[PDB]
Structure formats: C-alpha cells, structure tokens
Specification:
Length: 109
C-alpha cells in the first residue's frame, strides 16, 4: 500500500540523500534524530513501512520540510485547512488523506 504515494516515491528515490544534504535544516532533523532516522531507513529498506508510519508527526514534519508551496497541487489533490491553519491533503485519486504535502521532490524516478 501507498507505494506510489509522493512520500514513498521521494523517500525511496535514488537521489533522496542528495536532496536531503542540499537542505541543511532537513539534514539536521534527520542526522540528529534516532527515531526519525530509523523510520526513514526502515522505509528505504522496505517501503511497506511508510504506510505503517504514515501519520507519525516527526516523519510528516520532516517530509514537509521539502514541500514547495509555490507549485500547483497535482491533479486530483485538494488542500484543506484547520481553524489553526494546519493543512491536510486529500488525494481524491486514491481517496486517501495525509498531512504530507504532495509538492515534494523526486516524484518521477
């Protein structure tokens, strides 16, 4: 499940670590964690782990560091927002909701 999600595509992409190192603060979040780094490495080894960790707040916040909110949302996605302005993302294509912004890199192999 979720093997074609933007988050799995990004985390398991050949160039994930290049994109990570190019974002210094994201690099700090990854490098200095224990649990987040462990979860990212588990997903990279076995992508089934992403669905298992999909709503984990630290994983969501980390992947959202890479979101480019200047881009259009991809076809079929909708943003909804909290009274507190927290955004969530509905992929009406797969009828699934996530806190992770689909406008993250490394989506196409």
């Amino acid at each position: 499940l979720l093997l074609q999600s933007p988050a799995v595509k990004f985390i398991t992409n050949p160039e994930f670590f290049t994109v990570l190192h190019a974002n210094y603060s994201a690099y700090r979040v990854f490098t200095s964690s224990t649990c987040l780094k462990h979860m990212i490495l588990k997903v990279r080894r076995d992508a089934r782990n992403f669905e298992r960790y999909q709503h984990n707040r630290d994983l969501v916040n980390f992947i959202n560091m890479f979101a480019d909110t200047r881009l259009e949302l991809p076809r079929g996605w909708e943003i909804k927002t909290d009274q507190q302005g927290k955004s969530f993302f509905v992929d009406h294509n797969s009828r699934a909701t996530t806190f992770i912004d689909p406008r993250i890199p490394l989506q196409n192999g």
